[PDB]
Amino acid sequence: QNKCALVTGSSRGVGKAAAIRLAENGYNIVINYARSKKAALETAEEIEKLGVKVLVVKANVGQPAKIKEMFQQIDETFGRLDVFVNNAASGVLRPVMELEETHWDWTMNINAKALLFCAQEAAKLMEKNGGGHIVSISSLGSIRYLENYTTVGVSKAALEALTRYLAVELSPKQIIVNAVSGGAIDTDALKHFPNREDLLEDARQNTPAGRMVEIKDMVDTVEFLVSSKADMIRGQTIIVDGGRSLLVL
Amino acid sequence: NKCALVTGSSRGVGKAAAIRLAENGYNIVINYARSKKAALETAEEIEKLGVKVLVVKANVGQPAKIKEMFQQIDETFGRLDVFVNNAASGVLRPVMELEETHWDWTMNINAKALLFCAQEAAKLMEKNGGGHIVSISSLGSIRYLENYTTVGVSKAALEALTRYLAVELSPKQIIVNAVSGGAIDTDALKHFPNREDLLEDARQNTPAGRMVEIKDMVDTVEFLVSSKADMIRGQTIIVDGGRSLLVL
Amino acid sequence: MEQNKCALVTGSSRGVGKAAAIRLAENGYNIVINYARSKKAALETAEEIEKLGVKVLVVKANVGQPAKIKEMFQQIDETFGRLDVFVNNAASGVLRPVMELEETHWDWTMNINAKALLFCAQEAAKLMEKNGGGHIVSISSLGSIRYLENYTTVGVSKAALEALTRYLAVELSPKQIIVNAVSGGAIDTDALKHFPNREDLLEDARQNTPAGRMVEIKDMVDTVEFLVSSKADMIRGQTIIVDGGRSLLVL
Amino acid sequence: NKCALVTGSSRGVGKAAAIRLAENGYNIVINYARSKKAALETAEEIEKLGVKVLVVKANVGQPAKIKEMFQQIDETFGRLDVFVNNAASGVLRPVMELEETHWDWTMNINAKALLFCAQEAAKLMEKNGGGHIVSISSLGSIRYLENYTTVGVSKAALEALTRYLAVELSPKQIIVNAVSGGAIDTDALKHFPNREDLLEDARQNTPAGRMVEIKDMVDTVEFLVSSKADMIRGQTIIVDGGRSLLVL
Numbered sequence A: 001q002n003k004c005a006l007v008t009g010s011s012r013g014v015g016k017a018a019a020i021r022l023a024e025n026g027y028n029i030v031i032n033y034a035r036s037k038k039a040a041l042e043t044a045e046e047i048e049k050l051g052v053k054v055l056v057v058k059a060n061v062g063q064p065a066k067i068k069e070m071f072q073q074i075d076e077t078f079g080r081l082d083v084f085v086n087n088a089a090s091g092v093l094r095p096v097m098e099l100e101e102t103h104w105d106w107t108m109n110i111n112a113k114a115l116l117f118c119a120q121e122a123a124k125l126m127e128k129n130g131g132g133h134i135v136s137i138s139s140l141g142s143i144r145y146l147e148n149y150t151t152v153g154v155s156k157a158a159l160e161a162l163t164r165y166l167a168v169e170l171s172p173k174q175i176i177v178n179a180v181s182g183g184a185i186d187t188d189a190l191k192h193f194p195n196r197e198d199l200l201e202d203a204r205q206n207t208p209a210g211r212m213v214e215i216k217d218m219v220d221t222v223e224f225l226v227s228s229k230a231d232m233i234r235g236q237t238i239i240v241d242g243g244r245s246l247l248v249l
Numbered sequence B, D: 001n002k003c004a005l006v007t008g009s010s011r012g013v014g015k016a017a018a019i020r021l022a023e024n025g026y027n028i029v030i031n032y033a034r035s036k037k038a039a040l041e042t043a044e045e046i047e048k049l050g051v052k053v054l055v056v057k058a059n060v061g062q063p064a065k066i067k068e069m070f071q072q073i074d075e076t077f078g079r080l081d082v083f084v085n086n087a088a089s090g091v092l093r094p095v096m097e098l099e100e101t102h103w104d105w106t107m108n109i110n111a112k113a114l115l116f117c118a119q120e121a122a123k124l125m126e127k128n129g130g131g132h133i134v135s136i137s138s139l140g141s142i143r144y145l146e147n148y149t150t151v152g153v154s155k156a157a158l159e160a161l162t163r164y165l166a167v168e169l170s171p172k173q174i175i176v177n178a179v180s181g182g183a184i185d186t187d188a189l190k191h192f193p194n195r196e197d198l199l200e201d202a203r204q205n206t207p208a209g210r211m212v213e214i215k216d217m218v219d220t221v222e223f224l225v226s227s228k229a230d231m232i233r234g235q236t237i238i239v240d241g242g243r244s245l246l247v248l
Numbered sequence C: 001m002e003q004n005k006c007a008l009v010t011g012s013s014r015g016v017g018k019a020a021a022i023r024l025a026e027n028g029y030n031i032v033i034n035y036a037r038s039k040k041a042a043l044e045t046a047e048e049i050e051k052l053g054v055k056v057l058v059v060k061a062n063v064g065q066p067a068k069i070k071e072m073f074q075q076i077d078e079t080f081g082r083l084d085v086f087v088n089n090a091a092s093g094v095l096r097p098v099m100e101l102e103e104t105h106w107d108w109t110m111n112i113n114a115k116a117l118l119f120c121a122q123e124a125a126k127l128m129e130k131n132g133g134g135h136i137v138s139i140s141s142l143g144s145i146r147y148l149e150n151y152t153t154v155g156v157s158k159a160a161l162e163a164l165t166r167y168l169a170v171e172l173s174p175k176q177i178i179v180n181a182v183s184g185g186a187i188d189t190d191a192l193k194h195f196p197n198r199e200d201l202l203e204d205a206r207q208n209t210p211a212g213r214m215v216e217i218k219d220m221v222d223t224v225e226f227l228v229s230s231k232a233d234m235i236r237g238q239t240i241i242v243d244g245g246r247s248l249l250v251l
């Protein structure tokens, strides 16, 4: 058969566009979501027009038992997996002094713990045909301060560190692991930020490139990192931000 | 007089940090999870230096135990000036063998602890116009150490939390940083199946020509809480004899 | 002015630069080959590229001299009338212990490895404006940010090269010029013969790279090709490390 | 009595560092290129602290003048324990306006100088048990500062040379590191056509709620030469009030 790709959180936004790009390149697709079922089924219908097979799996990736159920479905339906894009994220955006334990656990479980358990199940499927590629999506708040972003920034720093440990430990399985970090993108996720207009204004005005990052720019780097043209890039996080992080003022 | 808490100060780096702060006149809170005998021995040594000591058993992996410990500090000393986040644990095995409990145990003790300890520290620090927070990290936050995934991932989280705390606690005049060490010959190395490899690497490959010692880590902590480092914020200072520079 | 896009690669008579130029030619770019002394190698290279059905200009220019750079870009404007891609690849160096370094060793290395990018980028930007933009990619190594034995002159020059990459990436952005770099681990090429510890570098790369093999010229060229492709237009002032995971390790 | 050299110590950070070391008991070598009166005033101030001072005119962009200066230090004091590479100059212009003379000027003074000065320092230090070398850098080494290309590129070269020197001088018992600052309101800042924007950005956006002062740079230099920083090697410590953490 043909190669298969899973993209977590692919009902909308970056994940959806990544799943479509992989489908355009001949991959069968696993679409994943937590609650936005209608958008997930609509994405699946769009992608099936390309002549690939699509499996839609509801699985909150913050719960390893749901991860394991999802991968059992992938194994039953396709019997293989070749590309895995860890893209889903959630979070609680408030000042650090107001954070509660549930806010930390929710965010860390979905955004960083997910990669460890998805990577384990992905590797077991990838070993069947000789390897594969894993790419995670991160942001500038892993290494810099974004206002109100503590829970998510800390999870993304864990995610990038996990990307390094997996990149070393899964190399014997011929699995290539890396991450792509973005500057701000005008998706539904920005609506979580009470300072949404400030972020957009800053991206529009202060990005050296002269425009904001778009979903296509993140997808283009994902595509490269799964393409076989990037097999000796390992454990790296590539920053796609139009040059915004280079500045001071 | 000012008061300092060091989590995990029954032995190793934390014990030495607490002793150094006592030598500097700070009253001390010693904290442990199970090593009570060692914690009381440490408290006895520190009272010889002429400061007061409070010993608190509190597993920092549990926010409720954290809150209890800072309630005792408020009742005993009524203030806090220095907080060193030093306690760590972990499960050291290959990534494919890790289970959810191994992740939760490690992330709760090593990284979640700083969040809840920092919130409680800040509440006490702002009573007297501020304070300093320093956390202890290692080269595995940014590089690969064998079987160290749970711990390395938690130290990367801790350094990122250090950056977020350093910005958001600045209005309270609290100065927050971290110190990352190369390998040190403490009881922690007993957790590693490759202990002898780590020591031999540190001995032979460190440019300085010797291993990092506890004293080197404490020297940087002492600098970071001294008032001479108040415009260093959110930084992780690497103390490794130059080991991480090499790319053999 | 040429109808098809045109690319310059400095130091393209052999090694990574030669391979990058052949790759760009395979993708339809007309090519400027550049060398300082290896004229025969540069001419054989151009002959292989002409068989791909693109035009090739061969220019001798020591890129450690800004005057020779200006002459080179004057030849490119005269022959092709445009430049769309510029890959700053040439390097030289003096490999010895830091205590044995003399001023001439520093000047030679900095001039060819780092100063070259500034003046080549200025001249490239002037040509790139004829068609509204372009891409500049420089080649660096792990010695920019780490210690590599005997590599002080070159490592310091590559750190300068990577900082110049960031400054150019910001300041050339209004001209729609995208500037980045690619940093490699060790590759079995003619350049390893410059190292008195060549065997130790090879043993290390072969034994300690997580990928289980050494970087090859092809892996460098694959990244170059991506960074000039239009798929990387919002990557700016970054250095992408291509080392099989080697730099991740400690022990 | 140990001896310390600080390049460019007629005014600004270099002057304050020389004063601080003199307060700590070091004999001092003051260095300048053109500000003779200022250098002489500085020496007079320092002589009042009870230490010996040597004033040496040497343009550090010229390795022959560097060699001459260290011969004078050897003859006068017979030793050197601390060397602070602080002198800098530059040409602040957009990248398209830069000429080869602007590059050579800036690179010779800011980066070439550390190589040759560290070579001569090491020959003196290794004769007497070793020493410390600290260079001063800025955020422009790793970030973009407007018009700062020549200086930012030279400072990236300086931080790389700091790494290479840290490794290769370790067998001589010489500890080499760097300190990178945010903006400071010194005479150097008047070379910037956007000085007012740098000052406003530093005052408004630094999380600490104030600008870095000369004293904060000096405090870190003092640490990095002190014995308490002997296992910090080839690191650049950022002193910027947390400014570099932000995006916006």
Ligand SMILES: NC(=O)C1=CN([C@@H]2O[C@H](COP(=O)(O)OP(=O)(O)OC[C@H]3O[C@@H](n4cnc5c(N)ncnc54)[C@H](OP(=O)(O)O)[C@@H]3O)[C@@H](O)[C@H]2O)C=CC1
Pocket: A008, A009, A010, A011, A012, A013, A014, A015, A032, A033, A034, A035, A036, A037, A059, A060, A061, A062, A086, A087, A088, A089, A090, A110, A137, A138, A139, A140, A181, A182, A183, A184, A185, A186, A187, A188, A189, A190
């Ligand atoms: N937008 C931006 O500016 C930037 C985004 N990022 C990263 O890009 C990635 C995608 O974000 P973006 O596309 O903007 O966000 P969107 O809100 O558009 O999409 C998020 C996707 O994640 C899914 N998801 C959320 N939680 C879970 C969960 N527990 N389990 C399974 N799926 C889940 C959502 O599905 P559902 O509705 O069912 O929850 C949705 O499909 C994230 O990792 C984000 O951190 C990085 C840099 C910048």
Ligand SMILES: NC(=O)C1=CN([C@@H]2O[C@H](COP(=O)(O)OP(=O)(O)OC[C@H]3O[C@@H](n4cnc5c(N)ncnc54)[C@H](OP(=O)(O)O)[C@@H]3O)[C@@H](O)[C@H]2O)C=CC1
Pocket: B007, B008, B009, B010, B011, B012, B013, B014, B031, B032, B033, B034, B035, B036, B058, B059, B060, B061, B085, B086, B087, B088, B089, B109, B136, B137, B138, B139, B180, B181, B182, B183, B184, B185, B186, B187, B188, B189
């Ligand atoms: N040793 C090394 O090579 C290096 C260590 N580090 C870091 O240094 C720090 C100290 O390690 P080190 O001194 O070597 O180790 P030690 O084993 O000597 O000391 C660990 C201390 O932490 C305490 N501790 C462990 N878990 C908890 C918990 N849940 N709650 C409260 N206290 C706890 C221990 O007490 P108890 O016995 O009661 O559990 C002990 O007092 C750690 O953060 C480690 O990550 C960093 C780099 C290198």
Ligand SMILES: NC(=O)C1=CN([C@@H]2O[C@H](COP(=O)(O)OP(=O)(O)OC[C@H]3O[C@@H](n4cnc5c(N)ncnc54)[C@H](OP(=O)(O)O)[C@@H]3O)[C@@H](O)[C@H]2O)C=CC1
Pocket: C010, C011, C012, C013, C014, C015, C016, C017, C034, C035, C036, C037, C038, C039, C061, C062, C063, C064, C088, C089, C090, C091, C092, C112, C139, C140, C141, C142, C183, C184, C185, C186, C187, C188, C189, C190, C191, C192
């Ligand atoms: N080989 C490796 O392990 C690695 C190499 N790199 C980098 O890759 C790049 C290419 O190296 P590599 O292909 O291995 O080296 P090679 O020796 O194979 O080729 C070097 C090329 O540079 C040219 N060159 C040297 N000096 C000048 C000059 N002054 N003016 C114009 N051309 C000049 C040479 O031509 P001529 O003979 O006429 O002088 C030759 O064409 C360099 O930037 C290097 O730092 C990076 C990481 C690893």
Ligand SMILES: NC(=O)C1=CN([C@@H]2O[C@H](COP(=O)(O)OP(=O)(O)OC[C@H]3O[C@@H](n4cnc5c(N)ncnc54)[C@H](OP(=O)(O)O)[C@@H]3O)[C@@H](O)[C@H]2O)C=CC1
Pocket: D007, D008, D009, D010, D011, D012, D013, D014, D031, D032, D033, D034, D035, D036, D058, D059, D060, D061, D085, D086, D087, D088, D089, D109, D136, D137, D138, D139, D180, D181, D182, D183, D184, D185, D186, D187, D188, D189
């Ligand atoms: N001010 C700031 O915001 C920041 C400064 N820095 C760094 O701090 C260091 C000191 O700068 P700062 O104190 O602000 O500047 P000042 O202008 O106050 O002092 C500069 C000193 O350098 C000397 N100097 C300049 N060129 C030479 C030369 N060729 N040979 C010998 N001495 C020379 C000057 O003496 P003379 O008059 O005789 O030439 C003078 O004593 C520099 O490395 C700078 O890059 C870093 C971050 C921020």
Ligand SMILES: Oc1cc(Cl)ccc1Oc1ccc(Cl)cc1Cl
Pocket: A088, A089, A090, A091, A092, A138, A139, A146, A152, A183, A184, A185, A189, A190, A192
């Ligand atoms: O990580 C991100 C970073 C930025 Cl700058 C913008 C959006 C991002 O993505 C998220 C942020 C918060 C939540 Cl609740 C969910 C998502 Cl997807």
Ligand SMILES: Oc1cc(Cl)ccc1Oc1ccc(Cl)cc1Cl
Pocket: B087, B088, B089, B090, B091, B137, B138, B140, B145, B151, B182, B183, B184, B188, B189, B191
């Ligand atoms: O973090 C560390 C890094 C290193 Cl190189 C050596 C020891 C370390 O500390 C620990 C490692 C594992 C566990 Cl279980 C507990 C501790 Cl205190």
Ligand SMILES: Oc1cc(Cl)ccc1Oc1ccc(Cl)cc1Cl
Pocket: C090, C091, C092, C093, C094, C095, C140, C141, C142, C143, C154, C185, C186, C187, C191, C192, C194
């Ligand atoms: O930069 C490099 C880094 C490595 Cl690991 C290997 C080779 C390199 O390339 C050079 C090294 C020295 C000189 Cl003189 C010339 C060149 Cl092309």
Ligand SMILES: Oc1cc(Cl)ccc1Oc1ccc(Cl)cc1Cl
Pocket: D087, D088, D089, D090, D091, D092, D137, D138, D140, D151, D182, D183, D184, D188, D189, D191
């Ligand atoms: O390096 C610096 C960085 C900053 Cl933010 C401010 C001043 C600096 O120092 C200089 C900058 C330019 C010149 Cl001509 C001379 C010097 Cl001393």
